[PDB]
Design a protein around this ligand. Structure first.
Ligand SMILES: NC(=O)c1ccc[n+]([C@@H]2O[C@H](COP(=O)([O-])OP(=O)(O)OC[C@H]3O[C@@H](n4cnc5c(N)ncnc54)[C@H](O)[C@@H]3O)[C@@H](O)[C@H]2O)c1
Ligand SMILES: NC(=O)c1ccc[n+]([C@@H]2O[C@H](COP(=O)([O-])OP(=O)(O)OC[C@H]3O[C@@H](n4cnc5c(N)ncnc54)[C@H](O)[C@@H]3O)[C@@H](O)[C@H]2O)c1
Ligand SMILES: [Mg+2]
Ligand SMILES: [Mg+2]
Lengths: 488, 488, 488, 491
């Protein structure tokens, strides 16, 4: 049994709350450790540590700040196997999934190496007679980020890389479900040459989150998670006068046109639907074949691929898919699957009976596939976040388009087609922030930016890319002239 | 007596609430007209009108959208006299001030002529193997803007020019104190070739604003006004999931170093302290001379010039200054002046007695100058928004800098000095968004961006400049590839 | 008979060389006027004028400079018919063509209205300890532009709009074939409020070009014309230490894939092949159908449309196409046509017979269409610049792509297809600067940039867009710090 | 001469010998002795390097930007690991101190750091609905194969200036470095291979004018970048353009420091010592002219400078306390000595005379003592000519306008500096001067890797600077696509 505390001022520390939460191993269903839940006083200590450290860090030139990230990237590559094992053991996903998690975080770190260029502001000479005008992008001061269970490496680095690169200090409040990676990341930042107090990790639940939102020394909050919590963090942050960016849930659709490469479409669906047991806000949860023949041919190819998925713990490196994160998630998913049957959807692949020998207590659910799903059913309206894929049969292109158009969620969407007209038209019109053309998971790369539309995000600036530099800096504008003096 | 309604769908329309507010001529103190206070039906009609028109507007190419602003700029020039007259008549400020108000709005309209270039997004070829990745900046849809009494031309234009250039529809809720100019602007947009429904004006008070904040079809809200109301709007907009940018109050300081051009500092203090009867969020309301000799010489120069300010109605074109906007504002200012005297400050120029013959009921206050002001006084802590300049004597550079630094407000600040070290150091350290070096009112031009720090703004994007374009657009990122086909 | 001189220092002035050049009315073959050919002395006078005015102009703020362009755009709209008339009368093209010529130049003027944003440079705070680093984009001084016969409005404006917006003085040496428009444009710039001497027009031939290339006070040269002369001007300018951008000839191919809309492609070929009598470096001169059926079906649709082209003077407002610019041009084209026949190509529409009643001395040639053209033929290798379209039957996709790939010219190219894969692959791989997907004449808009590859351009910066702002400015970088002074 | 080493070329991931059997001698300038030789490329040697580049470039251009950037991240780490070795070989051929050599390498390293951001930097522009259903977008694609010609004084920094953005952008690159000190460039190319760059993407071709002409007339090389003297820059620029190539060339300097009466004179004098005599003045950003304003400023400045010039520690790279080493060649030494003589015979006052200086045990080294001239006027050779040696000239200016007009009127416009406390004087001076790089209380205003380097007037040719975003522009060509679709299977 291991006990995680917090990471403050360069050290792992125990905290003072007398509160803990259990860390499970979701493959066995057993408790493997605890994590401390920060009190308001523990949060205050992290803020005071960030306050004491931030000015010297902001006073370090951009090139030197960038060198910390360069060093950190090498450390990540050096510590990859260790990081992935601790991630998988708490989260449930495969070693390869876990490495992908780390790698996508690493890529934001690579991006912020370019902070000297990225943080440039604008200069105008002769805005008026002898008058120059120029901006400067200065740190906001102290930022905080709140992250979900599914990417405990990538999403923290999404936020802390640009925030710290811009010369802010940063308080990370990660998911209490799987907190080993975030602490290890902050430890590695120290090893990379980051001053103590610039990246603090404060573990906790709602209590720690409320403490962050109400602290008058925190300037900016970044959130990734479910839509209901995203709304609450966004509204509350604003109510406290802070800047905020929040990113929510999804029900990503893949539309399949009759001219599409059906083999590639089926392959994309198995990976996008069932990768990480469907625990992704960019999982494809709805497949929309256009026309009966397309549906039938696609289902024909897809069904066997779902049935032959290898399910197992992270120690089995041959497995395609692991358990879901908690018993609660398991039960919530199972209840949703039952509602699908009850409401008239056809469960073509039924995974409810799956048990893994030796792991009967793990949070394991077999792959599920529903056909004849309709927009009024719960399995369609609700983000399931499990290995459950729904097929809605569309009669034509306009009908197919209107499905993701009309959904509450607008995170990601995909269209599979050979037709340039269909792809252009669909990607132009859809009210969804991230679009795949023959690409099933259209997550933009670290140097572009990430953000959904509709109920999938709140605020006006995305994750990473240039948007992140904007979010973590305040603009100062100077207008400048001089009286005539000694030159005359 | 005139009776202003709303401007919805290309025309002037009567309100349907049955409630009006009184429009005063501040120079005589009598009612000259009324303005309707929008009901929910009024806002709903404005939203429906916007919804009907926005798609075809967004589908118009950027160069064609730009040509509308082209035309509009010419129409503003042609109608300059008429616009200035109606502005001054309701506001109080001089015709010259009213032209300035309009022209600074006009310059945002010129800036957005560049919308084809401004709206460009980013393309990457070969992000992956055969994969291209690119963003598009699309309209948010329908936006709203809430504006204050003091600039009913400029500030409406600040918001609606980029909002509309970006392909959005825009609902203006201007100050009910002086709503003539806003309706006339919407009318001139129609004459410029703007489609009906794209710029709508809904007049009203807290009622209209709350309707705007809670209407599910408005995506974005921009606010300029007092800090308390900015706090409210920012929080409420966010609680409803909207993007928001809010800009608040001020207590702008000018620091005068002993090496400064004192003649120019003193002239700048007359202009910035007493222009518009001090009714500006970029008015200088604190003069911070460094050293006794600097303070005493500055007082020597200011006294005769504050005393000789010519005060009068807008029909008097020699007047340096007009009346304040309402009886309420006047009483608030006079009350704060009294507290200055009560709390020990030295009223070296007393304008309390000033009366204008023929205009005995107008809201006229003579220029006031306080010396020996300290930071514990009400006249120092509170934004007065009137013709009251306070002098706080600092002993050295560090004492002087700490004054605007510790202030609750952080809109603008100025430093007067011949010394490059003092200027650079001051501009770099001060926690204030807009800094002037030998410039009294460092309002950036339309092509740079406007926004204060601390309690002077909320959100993460400024007014106009490229910030505004970011605020009025949402980012869509497409990831794109193709299966082998007919080319093979 | 009319006599054109030069436009120097705000005035139409006479040439002092005594040498003149004939201006033809291509529709009748008669001489309608003469244009002065600049001496070395005439050029020197224009440079002395430019040198005298540029400092004051560069000292004018970017908003004021932009306003000149705003007024100019209105003056162009006001004078459209007169401009188009003088253009068509000297060039030969239709009024509608001439209006397009002027409009596209007008669009560059609209783009440079945004010069205050476009000319921004970069700022870094704390590049070192207490050290700031920032660039300024300042004028190059005096530029020159050399332009060809076919777009005597658009091309001059391409060059002088950004040159002048950037704070430079500009010397235009337009084509002596049709010099009425360029002078009128200079005159209108004056009316728009441009100071005298900022835009001078120096008419002439090689003599004037050589005088520009060897004048020590001209910093930069822009050229558009034939490849042989672009090569000469690029080399000579550089041997004289000038910066240079030169843009050359073309042999634009259109690839028609078997899945293309053949109606649309044939219609596009008529406009792009025969518009302006094919006197465009973005004209399609080679059609490349893929497959036997595609070629046969295409030839079939084209023939009746080529046969029924309406050919007349600009005074016949029903005409689709006018005469070519000179008898020299006409003899060259006819000579090329004959070479096509003798080299084995099938002439399926023979325009050689064409004569127009009452216009027997006009430079009229009927539309020509060849089939079975192969890469070894002169009509394939040589830019014809006449109404002669060549069809090259491709067997497959790779064969079709290799045709424009291997051509010495690489100005524009187009692919007609419904297939995303084919479109993307062709566009990505082709060694040609301007690529159309279902667009026959992919000339970028003013806010993007123009320029070919291979033999079609020389230098490292394109015409208009942000490229042009880069070409007409030089970068200065300031590194700045201050010693400890009075602030301490 | 002892045991000499022999450098050839670096082509396709390997050191290879020259096929011309012509060599150039490599000296140790501390001793004056030959220590090795370098091969001078034939046309065939260059042709081999171009063919090498041609075969390899397409696959490298097809590698995604993030993967290209990682080669540079690894390379940066390799530079740090090999810093001491790299500095040693540089100093031994060039003359400058080990610390100088490390700064040379570090500034090259900083360009490699900047091009790690190539994925963001290479982005192009997109417009939706430029017309009805019509989209318009650009792509920045490789030019193909570039070449760079570099001078003796920074054989690490300058090659990296050029090859880092060229290679990050997806091109292959042929470096032709100075034959004076060719060890570093080849070792850099070796380290690029060790960092994972494919063979043939960075080739090094050693040689003289012959190799340069072979570069300038090779039809497969699309772009040339040159840094060196103004006469050769003119030649490279013109000839490149004659051959249809794009080119950017960077030339000589005569950098002035203007000292206002209100300046921190002690900081100015200290700055002049470093900027005037660092690397024995062999820098195109060395201050070679001081311009004090007014009598007292001049007299006091001179008085400060004299004993600091006199007490400079001069020695070989093996003496780690030296401020300055020998100049690069015998030729360079003779030319510096001729120019010093010219100053005396044309009337300048040689207040510190370094002509006599000899170092015990290094009598044949190219060592010259620090020199300082007062009462220099604009008609003298020491003023008009770039000396490239440890010779500082003091021109007395009576006022601000006169002080400003000296760098204004000079043929060269590489760098300039103004020392003052006055915001007005600095702003005005920096705004008006016709010189590309300006220091305000900064003696050597060389911009950082993420900004850009370029002089004005005679100091540069072309329209794009070195490094910064300019370099990304220079190493890419713009393609624009205009795109629409006909009614399809969606209808
Ligand atoms: N350009 C400038 O000078 C400038 C810029 C920013 C802010 N300001 C600020 O404007 C203020 C004075 O103008 P004002 O009196 O019009 O400001 P205000 O805050 O009273 O009103 C601004 C807007 O909010 C609305 N509003 C007022 N009370 C409300 C309530 N209780 N609930 C909801 N909405 C409400 C008003 O109708 C008006 O449209 C000063 O504090 C000043 O700093 C001025
Ligand atoms: N950062 C810097 O310090 C810097 C920057 C730019 C320029 N410089 C300049 O470098 C110059 C000194 O260096 P250098 O002596 O190596 O310069 P150089 O001009 O003699 O040589 C530069 C390059 O050109 C080649 N070359 C020389 N002569 C040639 C000819 N006749 N034809 C073709 N190619 C030829 C050389 O082989 C070498 O690679 C100074 O003028 C200085 O201003 C220095
Ligand atoms: Mg297949
Ligand atoms: Mg398997």
């Amino acid at each position: 049994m291991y006990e995680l505390g917090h990471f403050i001022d360069g050290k792992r520390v125990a905290g003072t709350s007398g509160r803990v939460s259990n860390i499970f191993n979701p493959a066995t269903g057993e408790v493997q450790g605890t994590v401390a839940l920060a009190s308001d006083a523990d949060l205050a200590a992290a803020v005071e540590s960030a306050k004491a450290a931030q000015p010297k860090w902001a006073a370090t030139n951009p090139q030197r700040r960038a060198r910390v990230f360069m060093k950190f990237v090498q450390l990540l590559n050096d510590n990859m196997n260790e990081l992935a094992e601790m991630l998988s053991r708490e989260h449930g996903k495969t070693i390869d999934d876990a490495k992908g998690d780390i790698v996508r975080g690493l890529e934001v770190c690579e991006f912020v190496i370019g902070i000297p260029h990225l943080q440039k502001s604008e200069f105008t000479e002769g805005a008026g007679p002898g008058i120059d005008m120029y901006s400067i992008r200065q740190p906001v001061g102290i930022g905080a980020g709140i992250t979900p269970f599914n990417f405990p490496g990538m999403i923290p680095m999404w936020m802390f890389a640009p925030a710290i690169a811009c010369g802010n200090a940063f308080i990370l409040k990660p998911s209490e479900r799987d907190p080993s990676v975030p602490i290890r990341l902050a430890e590695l930042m120290i090893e990379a040459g980051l001053p103590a107090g610039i990246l603090n990790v404060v573990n906790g639940d709602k209590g720690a989150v409320d403490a962050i939102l109400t602290h008058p020394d925190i300037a900016a909050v970044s959130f990734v998670g479910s839509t209901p919590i995203a709304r609450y963090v966004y509204g509350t942050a604003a109510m406290n006068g802070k800047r905020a960016q929040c990113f929510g849930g999804a029900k990503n659709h893949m539309i399949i046109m009759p001219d599409a490469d059906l083999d590639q479409a089926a392959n994309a669906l198995i990976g996008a639907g069932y990768g990480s047991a469907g625990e992704r806000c960019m999982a494809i949860s709805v497949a929309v074949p256009v026309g009966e023949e397309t549906a039938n041919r696609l289902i024909d190819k897809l069904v066997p691929m779902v049935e032959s998925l290898r399910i197992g713990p992270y120690t089995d490196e041959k497995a395609d898919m692991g358990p879901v994160v908690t018993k609660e998630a398991e039960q919530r998913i199972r209840s949703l699957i039952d509602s699908g049957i009850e409401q008239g959807a056809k469960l073509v692949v039924d995974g409810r009976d799956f048990k893994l020998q030796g792991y009967e207590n793990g949070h394991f659910i077999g792959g599920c596939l529903f056909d004849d799903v309709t927009p009024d059913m719960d399995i369609y309206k609700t983000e399931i976040f499990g290995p459950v894929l729904s097929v809605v049969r569309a009669r034509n292109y306009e009908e197919a388009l209107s499905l993701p158009m009309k959904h509450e969620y607008g995170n990601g969407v995909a269209i599979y087609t050979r037709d340039g007209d269909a792809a252009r038209d669909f990607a132009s019109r859809i009210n969804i922030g991230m679009v795949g053309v023959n690409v099933p998971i259209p997550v933009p790369l670290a140097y572009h930016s990430f953000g959904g539309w509709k109920s999938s995000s709140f605020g006006d600036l995305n994750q990473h890319g240039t948007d992140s530099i904007k979010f973590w800096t305040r603009t100062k504008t100077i207008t400048s002239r001089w009286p005539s003096g000694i030159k005359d």
